[PDB]
Amino acid sequence: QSVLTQPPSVSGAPGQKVTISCTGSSSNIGGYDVHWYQQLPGMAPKLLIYDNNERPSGISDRFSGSKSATSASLAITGLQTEDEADYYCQSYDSSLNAWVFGGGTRLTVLGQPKAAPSVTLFPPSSEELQANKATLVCLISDFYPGAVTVAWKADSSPVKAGVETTTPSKQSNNKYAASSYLSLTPEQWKSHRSYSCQVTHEGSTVEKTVAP
Amino acid sequence: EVQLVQSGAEVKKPGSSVKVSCKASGYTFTDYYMHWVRQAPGQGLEWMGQINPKTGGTNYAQKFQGRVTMTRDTSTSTAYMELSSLRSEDTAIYYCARGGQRLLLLRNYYFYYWGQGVLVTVSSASTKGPSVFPLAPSSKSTSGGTAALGCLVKDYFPEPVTVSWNSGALTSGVHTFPAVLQSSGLYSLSSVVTVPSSSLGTQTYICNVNHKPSNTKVDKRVEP
């Protein structure tokens, strides 16, 4: 899928160093220079490093690149909240005769206090039930950092079917929000004592449950 | 100074074809190769190919060989990328990015100048207005409280929808969540509003949901 290889994610406290690896082969990095792009959310990729270690005008010296044999590396010092973005390496492959990219590394800057999520669980409305559908809605908010997993139970038994969960999204207050939906038949809704939405955050669990 | 201005954002059906444009200004169009780079949402960058603006000559990435046509209109300084036989996995942001100078034997191969990118959404789904359902106040899930009530905006296509409360009069304590995409190919979202318990029965709460693509407006009163 992607010819160059990067770690999917790195993270750091403000002020610290992070390093992002880009691994290739003799057919790409072994023969060609490596360039690096910083993609802020909603933006086109922005050239961050070119020709292994050069910076475009405007790019801070906190960003440095290096290349070695068949890999390349992007070093970031004095990590800032502004550095939160996706980082891509790029080169060219002579075997493929094609430009090649790394799969990207998501950098998170831990610029807020850790916070457990608030969890609100809504039962199906009578209107949806009359449409012979049923959706439980689990709303998760004000957690930090922005990574949760959601587990649904019917009574005590887990349900994986019909579960749809958004990725976390940054609120206006810089904490995160997410939602999870459990689709049921109205029969399924009525035929259990309860349904639970369990949200796991940093190895801690917050749970809400509702009942017909 | 140099600007790459893109167009062609849309929602397509699988099997169809899309043509995205990239108009170059601020330099002599014919002096630099033009490249196309796609990015499926949440995913990485994918080189599609390049075009020589002077000659019209092209080189396509392997993956797209059977399906892509890159052209140029030198008189409008515009490069075109047409992708055919679209399927859902062609859902992506399509960027044009300027390459190295055409005549140079050893030219640069990073991308400094990018177009803003154009979203192409490929889905079998047809335009569908949402069903709106009230999320009746669960008093025992807002510790402290207050209490949160809301509106579920279910099964619409395509994005976006917008929601307000009380025709926009109520704005505080309002949280409208990012939509989710379901197996049906349809989207759903919720909007919730955190509110003083004693004010539940004294008004009250009406969610106004606008889905422009389907010309649907729903005003849902949420009773406790």
Burial of A13 (0-12, 13-18, 19+ CB in 10 A): exposed
Decide if B154 and A128 are in contact by the 8 Å CB cutoff.
yes
Domain ranges of chain B: 1-124, 125-224
**Which value, to the nearest 10 degrees, does the dihedral of the CA atoms of residues A73, A78, A82, A87 take?**
10
Contact A34, A91 (CB under 8 A): yes
Q: Give the Cα-Cα-Cα angle B80, B85, B88 (nearest 5 degrees).
A: 100
Domains of chain A as residue ranges with CATH = 1-111 (2.60.40.10), 112-212 (2.60.40.10)
B207 neighbourhood in chain A, CB within 8 Å: none
Tokens (6 digits) for B150: 């809301």
- Give the residues across from B12 on adjacent strands: B122
Please identify which residue in the block is written with the tokens 């669980």: A121
Note whether A9 contacts B: Cβ–Cβ < 8 A.
no
Decide if A51 and B110 are in contact by the 8 Å CB cutoff.
yes
Q: Residue type for A42, please?
A: G
Q: How far is A77 from chain B (nearest CA, A)?
A: 23
Question: What method did the depositors use to determine the structure?
Answer: X-ray
Please identify which residue in the block is written with the tokens 């939602």: A179
Decide if A135 and B136 are in contact by the 8 Å CB cutoff.
no
Q: How far is B223 from chain A (nearest CA, A)?
A: 11
Give, in words, the CATH class of B125-224. mainly beta
Decide if A44 and B117 are in contact by the 8 Å CB cutoff.
yes
C-alpha A190/C-alpha A129 separation (Å) is 10
Domain B1-124 is found in CATH 3.40.50.300? no
Decide if A125 and B175 are in contact by the 8 Å CB cutoff.
no
Tokens (6 digits) for A51: 């020709």
Neighbours of A104 (CB within 10 A): 26
Decide if B136 and A125 are in contact by the 8 Å CB cutoff.
yes
DSSP E strand boundaries for chain B: 3-7, 10-12, 18-25, 32-39, 46-51, 58-60, 68-73, 78-83, 92-101, 118-122, 131-138, 148-156, 162-165, 174-176, 180-181, 187-194, 205-211, 216-222
Q: Is the peptide bond before B204 cis (omega within 30 degrees of 0)?
A: yes
B195 neighbourhood in chain A, CB within 8 Å: none
Q: Do domains B1-124 and B125-224 have the same CATH topology?
A: yes
Please identify which residue in the block is written with the tokens 């008004």: B203
Name the residue among B135, B142, B175 with its Cβ closest to that of A125: B135
B182 neighbourhood in chain A, CB within 8 Å: 164, 181, 183
Note whether A96 contacts B: Cβ–Cβ < 8 A.
yes
Please identify which residue in the block is written with the tokens 């959601």: A150
A178 neighbourhood in chain B, CB within 8 Å: 177
What resolution does the deposited structure have, in angstroms?
1.9
User: B48-79 b/e with 16+ CB inside 10 Å = b?
Assistant: bbbbbbbeeeeebbeebeeebbbebeeeebbb
Contact B18, B120 (CB under 8 A): yes
> How far, CA to CA in Å, does B206 sit from each of A134, A150, B202?
22, 30, 13
In this structure, what are the phi and psi dihedrals at residue A82, rounded to the nearest 5 degrees?
-65, -20
C-alpha B152/C-alpha B132 separation (Å) is 6
* Mode of pairing for the β-strands spanning A176-184 and B180-181: unpaired
Contact A11, A108 (CB under 8 A): yes
